[PDB]
């Protein structure tokens, strides 16, 4: 996250730290056994950490988990960038609520353009040139008119939200992918892609629009037929 500050230690109890072969991502604990992240974060040998804040001062209740079930969309396009960038993972063992662990459930509605959203992650705090923080950084951004992202990014995937600061300065960045966009207290986005360098004017973040995936998520977890992702 560029342009933010250290998250409050208690404000991200649902935030998962996802490490995979040569890669850092975030994710979101949506219940006691399941995490949503970006499918592009699945780079192999995934380890998912819950209840983490400082990477160097381990919370007493921090936990390591592994994928036991893994789902993503099979109706993606190839002509848009990272279409349906979402992956639903069941953890190998559940995680109970604790000081630093609690799920964030599914949104009741998508967020209005203009909504203030929180972004967070352990991704780079500088762009260009990686500077990885020990603690997750957080910033407030806004849901932007989708046309802003359409203007910035030819080949933008559908089922996404455009979010950032129109003037730039605050943004997610490399390493924050998979992490949540929280607007009006609701889990609304999973960071997928955005401009590099990050935090550029009119080059916002593209977040998979969680609301659109509610039924898919529920179908998968509640017994899964061969559930289909939203078109
Ligand atoms: C889809 O496009 C990506 C680049 O956007 C490319 O890496 C990939 O090979 C394409 N899929 C096919 C047809 O192999
Ligand atoms: C880091 O990358 C960017 C260009 O991609 C630039 O600021 C710089 O030349 C590189 N290294 C540093 C820190 O000088
Ligand atoms: C890390 O992930 C890459 C790509 O998925 C894979 O080639 C490699 O085997 C993984 N690391 C190991 C040694 O398991
Ligand atoms: Cl599907």
mmCIF file of N, CA, C and O in Angstrom, residues 23-61:
data_model
loop_
_atom_site.group_PDB
_atom_site.id
_atom_site.type_symbol
_atom_site.label_atom_id
_atom_site.label_comp_id
_atom_site.label_asym_id
_atom_site.label_seq_id
_atom_site.Cartn_x
_atom_site.Cartn_y
_atom_site.Cartn_z
ATOM 1 N N UNK A 23 6.074 -15.266 -3.999
ATOM 2 C CA UNK A 23 4.967 -14.324 -4.034
ATOM 3 C C UNK A 23 4.279 -14.022 -2.717
ATOM 4 O O UNK A 23 4.054 -14.893 -1.895
ATOM 5 N N UNK A 24 3.910 -12.762 -2.571
ATOM 6 C CA UNK A 24 3.195 -12.260 -1.414
ATOM 7 C C UNK A 24 1.832 -11.777 -1.882
ATOM 8 O O UNK A 24 1.704 -11.136 -2.925
ATOM 9 N N UNK A 25 0.814 -12.125 -1.118
ATOM 10 C CA UNK A 25 -0.529 -11.628 -1.364
ATOM 11 C C UNK A 25 -1.235 -11.484 -0.045
ATOM 12 O O UNK A 25 -0.794 -12.006 0.978
ATOM 13 N N UNK A 26 -2.367 -10.808 -0.094
ATOM 14 C CA UNK A 26 -3.297 -10.832 0.999
ATOM 15 C C UNK A 26 -4.442 -11.769 0.687
ATOM 16 O O UNK A 26 -4.507 -12.393 -0.379
ATOM 17 N N UNK A 27 -5.343 -11.875 1.651
ATOM 18 C CA UNK A 27 -6.569 -12.629 1.477
ATOM 19 C C UNK A 27 -7.506 -12.227 2.595
ATOM 20 O O UNK A 27 -7.148 -11.426 3.464
ATOM 21 N N UNK A 28 -8.707 -12.789 2.568
ATOM 22 C CA UNK A 28 -9.728 -12.406 3.533
ATOM 23 C C UNK A 28 -10.358 -13.656 4.068
ATOM 24 O O UNK A 28 -10.849 -14.487 3.323
ATOM 25 N N UNK A 29 -10.337 -13.769 5.389
ATOM 26 C CA UNK A 29 -11.012 -14.839 6.081
ATOM 27 C C UNK A 29 -12.502 -14.521 6.079
ATOM 28 O O UNK A 29 -12.905 -13.533 6.659
ATOM 29 N N UNK A 30 -13.292 -15.335 5.390
ATOM 30 C CA UNK A 30 -14.730 -15.063 5.271
ATOM 31 C C UNK A 30 -15.587 -15.861 6.230
ATOM 32 O O UNK A 30 -16.769 -15.571 6.419
ATOM 33 N N UNK A 31 -14.984 -16.888 6.822
ATOM 34 C CA UNK A 31 -15.600 -17.598 7.907
ATOM 35 C C UNK A 31 -14.456 -18.324 8.579
ATOM 36 O O UNK A 31 -13.292 -18.032 8.289
ATOM 37 N N UNK A 32 -14.747 -19.255 9.469
ATOM 38 C CA UNK A 32 -13.650 -19.824 10.240
ATOM 39 C C UNK A 32 -12.808 -20.849 9.510
ATOM 40 O O UNK A 32 -11.817 -21.321 10.040
ATOM 41 N N UNK A 33 -13.156 -21.136 8.261
ATOM 42 C CA UNK A 33 -12.446 -22.167 7.525
ATOM 43 C C UNK A 33 -12.122 -21.784 6.101
ATOM 44 O O UNK A 33 -11.555 -22.590 5.376
ATOM 45 N N UNK A 34 -12.494 -20.576 5.685
ATOM 46 C CA UNK A 34 -12.387 -20.248 4.269
ATOM 47 C C UNK A 34 -11.808 -18.869 4.049
ATOM 48 O O UNK A 34 -12.118 -17.924 4.780
ATOM 49 N N UNK A 35 -10.964 -18.766 3.029
ATOM 50 C CA UNK A 35 -10.304 -17.534 2.671
ATOM 51 C C UNK A 35 -10.562 -17.236 1.206
ATOM 52 O O UNK A 35 -10.528 -18.130 0.366
ATOM 53 N N UNK A 36 -10.820 -15.967 0.915
ATOM 54 C CA UNK A 36 -10.876 -15.488 -0.450
ATOM 55 C C UNK A 36 -9.621 -14.700 -0.750
ATOM 56 O O UNK A 36 -9.205 -13.835 0.009
ATOM 57 N N UNK A 37 -9.040 -14.988 -1.903
ATOM 58 C CA UNK A 37 -7.872 -14.258 -2.363
ATOM 59 C C UNK A 37 -7.981 -14.123 -3.884
ATOM 60 O O UNK A 37 -9.059 -14.376 -4.438
ATOM 61 N N UNK A 38 -6.912 -13.680 -4.540
ATOM 62 C CA UNK A 38 -6.910 -13.540 -5.990
ATOM 63 C C UNK A 38 -6.368 -14.829 -6.563
ATOM 64 O O UNK A 38 -5.441 -15.398 -6.014
ATOM 65 N N UNK A 39 -6.932 -15.303 -7.669
ATOM 66 C CA UNK A 39 -6.425 -16.547 -8.206
ATOM 67 C C UNK A 39 -4.991 -16.393 -8.683
ATOM 68 O O UNK A 39 -4.243 -17.354 -8.661
ATOM 69 N N UNK A 40 -4.588 -15.185 -9.068
ATOM 70 C CA UNK A 40 -3.207 -15.025 -9.522
ATOM 71 C C UNK A 40 -2.189 -15.187 -8.409
ATOM 72 O O UNK A 40 -0.978 -15.290 -8.660
ATOM 73 N N UNK A 41 -2.678 -15.226 -7.174
ATOM 74 C CA UNK A 41 -1.814 -15.399 -6.036
ATOM 75 C C UNK A 41 -1.436 -16.847 -5.857
ATOM 76 O O UNK A 41 -0.561 -17.148 -5.057
ATOM 77 N N UNK A 42 -2.101 -17.737 -6.586
ATOM 78 C CA UNK A 42 -1.808 -19.154 -6.450
ATOM 79 C C UNK A 42 -0.613 -19.530 -7.297
ATOM 80 O O UNK A 42 -0.758 -20.043 -8.406
ATOM 81 N N UNK A 43 0.567 -19.280 -6.750
ATOM 82 C CA UNK A 43 1.802 -19.473 -7.489
ATOM 83 C C UNK A 43 2.551 -20.727 -7.019
ATOM 84 O O UNK A 43 3.683 -20.977 -7.433
ATOM 85 N N UNK A 44 1.894 -21.522 -6.176
ATOM 86 C CA UNK A 44 2.446 -22.798 -5.715
ATOM 87 C C UNK A 44 2.901 -22.764 -4.271
ATOM 88 O O UNK A 44 3.365 -21.734 -3.788
ATOM 89 N N UNK A 45 2.783 -23.901 -3.587
ATOM 90 C CA UNK A 45 3.195 -24.027 -2.187
ATOM 91 C C UNK A 45 2.586 -22.923 -1.325
ATOM 92 O O UNK A 45 3.313 -22.195 -0.648
ATOM 93 N N UNK A 46 1.265 -22.789 -1.362
ATOM 94 C CA UNK A 46 0.627 -21.715 -0.629
ATOM 95 C C UNK A 46 0.620 -21.973 0.862
ATOM 96 O O UNK A 46 0.324 -23.084 1.314
ATOM 97 N N UNK A 47 0.952 -20.932 1.612
ATOM 98 C CA UNK A 47 0.827 -20.939 3.058
ATOM 99 C C UNK A 47 0.003 -19.715 3.377
ATOM 100 O O UNK A 47 0.201 -18.662 2.773
ATOM 101 N N UNK A 48 -0.958 -19.870 4.280
ATOM 102 C CA UNK A 48 -1.866 -18.780 4.610
ATOM 103 C C UNK A 48 -1.759 -18.516 6.091
ATOM 104 O O UNK A 48 -1.950 -19.417 6.904
ATOM 105 N N UNK A 49 -1.467 -17.273 6.444
ATOM 106 C CA UNK A 49 -1.296 -16.917 7.837
ATOM 107 C C UNK A 49 -2.430 -16.044 8.276
ATOM 108 O O UNK A 49 -2.750 -15.061 7.625
ATOM 109 N N UNK A 50 -3.038 -16.419 9.394
ATOM 110 C CA UNK A 50 -4.118 -15.638 9.972
ATOM 111 C C UNK A 50 -3.625 -15.030 11.260
ATOM 112 O O UNK A 50 -2.689 -15.547 11.879
ATOM 113 N N UNK A 51 -4.253 -13.928 11.655
ATOM 114 C CA UNK A 51 -3.906 -13.256 12.896
ATOM 115 C C UNK A 51 -2.549 -12.603 12.911
ATOM 116 O O UNK A 51 -1.994 -12.349 13.979
ATOM 117 N N UNK A 52 -2.027 -12.296 11.721
ATOM 118 C CA UNK A 52 -0.723 -11.636 11.620
ATOM 119 C C UNK A 52 -0.847 -10.133 11.570
ATOM 120 O O UNK A 52 -1.751 -9.590 10.932
ATOM 121 N N UNK A 53 0.085 -9.456 12.231
ATOM 122 C CA UNK A 53 0.228 -8.032 12.044
ATOM 123 C C UNK A 53 1.690 -7.823 11.694
ATOM 124 O O UNK A 53 2.073 -7.795 10.519
ATOM 125 N N UNK A 54 2.530 -7.717 12.713
ATOM 126 C CA UNK A 54 3.945 -7.555 12.448
ATOM 127 C C UNK A 54 4.581 -8.894 12.070
ATOM 128 O O UNK A 54 4.486 -9.874 12.823
ATOM 129 N N UNK A 55 5.214 -8.931 10.898
ATOM 130 C CA UNK A 55 5.894 -10.137 10.435
ATOM 131 C C UNK A 55 7.054 -10.521 11.343
ATOM 132 O O UNK A 55 7.535 -11.665 11.315
ATOM 133 N N UNK A 56 7.500 -9.550 12.132
ATOM 134 C CA UNK A 56 8.667 -9.748 12.978
ATOM 135 C C UNK A 56 8.342 -9.761 14.458
ATOM 136 O O UNK A 56 9.230 -9.915 15.285
ATOM 137 N N UNK A 57 7.074 -9.563 14.790
ATOM 138 C CA UNK A 57 6.650 -9.641 16.167
ATOM 139 C C UNK A 57 5.370 -10.420 16.107
ATOM 140 O O UNK A 57 4.287 -9.848 15.923
ATOM 141 N N UNK A 58 5.498 -11.737 16.212
ATOM 142 C CA UNK A 58 4.366 -12.597 15.932
ATOM 143 C C UNK A 58 3.289 -12.471 16.983
ATOM 144 O O UNK A 58 3.535 -12.652 18.187
ATOM 145 N N UNK A 59 2.075 -12.175 16.530
ATOM 146 C CA UNK A 59 0.954 -12.168 17.437
ATOM 147 C C UNK A 59 0.827 -13.536 18.059
ATOM 148 O O UNK A 59 1.039 -14.566 17.397
ATOM 149 N N UNK A 60 0.488 -13.553 19.342
ATOM 150 C CA UNK A 60 0.408 -14.818 20.069
ATOM 151 C C UNK A 60 -0.586 -15.777 19.447
ATOM 152 O O UNK A 60 -0.411 -16.992 19.514
ATOM 153 N N UNK A 61 -1.613 -15.211 18.808
ATOM 154 C CA UNK A 61 -2.659 -16.002 18.212
ATOM 155 C C UNK A 61 -2.475 -16.195 16.707
ATOM 156 O O UNK A 61 -3.378 -16.683 16.044
#
